Structures are given as C-alpha cells and as structure tokens.
C-alpha cells in the first residue's frame, strides 16, 4: 500500500492560481519529482500534501489515514517526528535566532533525544555531511549564505531519518559540487533507509538523477506523469517538450 496517496486534490486561491485535481501515489524508497512552470502550483501542492494547506477538494491518505481528517495535534506530531519539510526559502524552515546546532537539535530532541553532547555531535556530523564546517554550529543562520541556509535546512529535516521528506527546490543556492554531495546523500538515504521524497525542482538533471517518477505541472494541472526517463526523453505533452528543449546543453571534451 502507498505510503502517501493523493486523490483528486485541489486548492485554488483563484481560477488558475494553485492546483486542481491532482492524484498520485508514493511508496517507500521512491522519489516523486515535480517539475513545471514557475507559478504552476508546485509549492502550493507541496504544502497541501505536507499538512500545511487544507485542500478544497480531494483526499490525502498517509499510511491509510486521511491527512486532514486527523486532529491538528496528530498532523503536527507527524511534521515534528515523522516528516521533513524543506522550504523554497531556506529561512522559512529555520529559526533565525537559534544557532545552526540548535536548529538541527530541535528535531532530534523532538524525537526524544535528551543528551546534549550526543545532539551536538550529531549536528556537527550532519553539518559536515552537507559540507558546512562544524565550527559554524554556534553561528546564527542570519550569518549564513543562502546555500548554507539551504543546506542547514536540509540537515535539520533529515537528521531524524524521516520516512517522508517534501522538498521545494532544495538545490537552490548550491554549487554543483555540494549539489552532487546532496544528491548522493539523498539517494543513499532513499535506498538504504527506504526514505520517500517529493522534490520540486527546476533542474532537470537533478530530477533525472534522483526522481523515480515525475509530475509535470502547468497552470495548476498535472499535464504529464510517469517514469522520469520516459517523461524527459519521450515527452508527449507540448509543454514538456518545450521544457526539455529549453535545457542548457553541455559538451564533452
């Protein structure tokens, strides 16, 4: 049975703004990439399926429990201990006045961790995992660069080894080397720990290397979906063809 099941999900701020009639499944150890036009409803959908925006229509089932039929307490418990959420703007997923170490350790303590030294050591290890120097642990995120904030948010949302991570453009602000580090980290987590990921991205290379399936969104509607390689290499919808044709081609020397 699917870890997450989305049926006829709809949320529209206005006639065209948001998403309408979105359905998909997700299982453990799988990545659902979401690509499409800027302003197509990807962030809105990610919020809705991550218990942050009540849909107007449709249902979300997590482990065969309707997401928005649950109590608010249960949803917050899921978002504290079970799920991870990486926001498009990194600071939206961080505590500005809390050090990086504290930002990471909040999640660990939410899972019952109560040893300060172990929490700090894990935070430093995860800072080194995302190539943030461990000597920045006590610095506030406001002193971090955009990419550093992004990586801190990722580390904060991955430290508890969640069963399901929603990510909005996680590679934003990352250099290609640290981007590759992050892709390897996520792939390893998915394959080993059976982590499931829903990743919104505009980098079709990241989608190709990471996403097991893809959803192409235009004007709030999923216009194409299926195997990532099939969608990117054999697009059927005109918009998907335009998107793949707009990719910046590289050359091999």
């Amino acid at each position: 049975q699917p870890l997450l099941s989305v049926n006829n999900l709809t949320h529209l701020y206005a006639p065209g703004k948001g998403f309408s009639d979105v359905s998909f499944d997700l299982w453990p150890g799988e990545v659902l990439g979401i690509v499409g036009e800027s302003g197509s409803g990807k962030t809105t959908l990610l919020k809705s399926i991550s218990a942050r925006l009540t849909p107007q229509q449709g249902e979300i089932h997590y482990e065969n429990r309707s997401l928005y039929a649950m109590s608010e307490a249960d949803r917050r418990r899921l978002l504290r201990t079970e799920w991870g959420v990486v926001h498009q703007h990194p600071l939206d997923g961080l505590r500005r006045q809390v050090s990086a170490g504290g930002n990471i350790g909040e999640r660990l303590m939410a899972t019952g961790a109560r040893h300060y030294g172990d929490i700090r050591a894990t935070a430093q290890k995860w800072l080194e995992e995302v190539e943030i120097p461990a000597n920045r642990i006590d610095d506030l995120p406001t002193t971090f660069s955009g990419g550093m904030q992004q990586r801190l948010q990722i580390a904060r949302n991955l430290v508890t080894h969640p069963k399901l991570v929603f990510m909005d453009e996680p590679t934003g602000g990352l250099d290609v080397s640290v981007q590759a580090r992050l892709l390897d980290l996520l792939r390893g987590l998915v394959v080993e720990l059976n982590l499931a990921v829903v990743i919104v991205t505009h980098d079709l290379g990241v989608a190709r290397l990471l996403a097991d399936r893809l959803l192409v969104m235009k004007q709030g509607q999923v216009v194409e979906s299926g195997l990532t390689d099939r969608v990117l290499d054999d697009p059927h919808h005109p918009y998907t063809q335009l998107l793949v044709s707009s990719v910046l081609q590289n050359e091999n020397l």
Partner: protein, 278 residues
Amino acid sequence: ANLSGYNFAYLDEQTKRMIRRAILKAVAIPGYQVPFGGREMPMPYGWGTGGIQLTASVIGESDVLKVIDQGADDTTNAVSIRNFFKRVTGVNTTERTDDATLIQTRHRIPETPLTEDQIIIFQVPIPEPLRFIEPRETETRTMHALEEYGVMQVKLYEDIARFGHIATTYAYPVKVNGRYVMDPSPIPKFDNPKMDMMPALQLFGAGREKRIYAVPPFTRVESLDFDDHPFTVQQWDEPCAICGSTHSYLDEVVLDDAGNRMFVCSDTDYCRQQSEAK
C-alpha cells in the same frame, strides 16, 4: 470566627463555586492552565490574588491555615494575607507545616514533607512556562494544545550552548503526568523535586493572569533537563548560621557594608524545628 461584615472567606458564593469548578477541572487535567473569572481582591494584582481566591474557595472553619512568603511566615505579605484570612474567616493559623491543613506559599515549598489531606496553594505571577519564550497567549495556548514544546527544548539547548548551563534558576519548567509542561511558580529549582509523587494536592493560582492549575497527589513531576546536564539544585558552601542545616534553601543576609554576610534557612519553621532539635 467571621465577624467582619463580609461573607465567609470574603468571596461571594458564586465566585467560590466558579473557582471550585475550575479547581476540579485543573485536577482532572494536571498541569493545564484553567482560565477562571477571577476578581479584584483587597491585595493588588501581583501580590497573591490567585492564591487568596483559591484559599477562600477551599478553606473551611476547621482548617489550620499556614501562609508563607519566601519560606517565612513573618514576611510582610504573608502577615498581610494571613491577617486578612483571620479577619474574614476566623480560622486557626499556624507556622508549623505539619499542623497545617492549608498552606498558601509564595516562592517556597516547605522543607518538611507534606502529608495526605494537606493542600499547598502556590501564588503564581506567570502561569505560562513558555511566556518568556513566546509572549503571546494566542500562540502558547495552541502550543499546549498541540504539545508543540520544541521552543522550550530549543531554549534549554541554546542556554547550554551559550553558558554551559540552563539559565532558568526558579520557576524551572516541569513536565506533569508525562504530558503538560507546567510552570511550578517562582520556587527555586531546589523545591522542584518535592513536587514529584507528593501525597498532598498542589494548587496554583495566577489571579492577574486568570489561571488555575493543579497537580494531584502522587503525580509525576519531572524537571526538563538533559542526561549530561541533569537537574541540579542550588548549593551553598555554608550551612545555616542559626540551625546549622545543610539540607535547606538558604537566604543571604548582608550584615555590614564591609561584605560580612550570613546564610539562614528560608524555611523559618524548619529552621526553628532544627534549632530546637539541637
């Protein structure tokens, strides 16, 4: 007896009944701040109105009332509150903890262990343990409802990272019955252990903030801490200068301008008992 022209315990019966319903709800929901329609007392808000209202709503003619402030019965506000209750109830009063049926206190739990059928009533300025992290009730209410206690844990961890220790020294937050994070009133951390699995019923009144909460007898009360930074109580290098006790919370009395000081028990009844034993 009551011979002052006021109703017994100075509260009208409607207010007593409302407060009593609040007390029962608080008992059934340990650690949860029960709002109540508190009234203005002859004491200013912030001078113990919540404790006064609780005691007035629970006290009877056969009760032996003990009132303490900073652990001492002779403190100015303790004298004021006790005299008020003697005026409007006529109840017997005592400075001895073991003879009290009701103990109204400000910032101390007596060193003498409490016993069954005793009720200890705490005066609470800030009933919300998250208030200094989150000044707004609109947010702390929801955080208690959803058990969203992360800001507190983050505060503690940031305190350790900054100073190497938790910065809170009194009103140290406590988890009650495994669920509710509760403010124990401004008692020093020294007293927090006494709240765990205590035979007496603990009541907490915040009159200005309009809250009542309770810890029933034999309820788990655990101070928030870390394994490598465990809850530690105040310690002093000196014993009590009067009774010689090393097991009591000490108050520092400045004797002269040249830096000479002494330390003496905050619990004056306990100090008297110790001095009489020796």
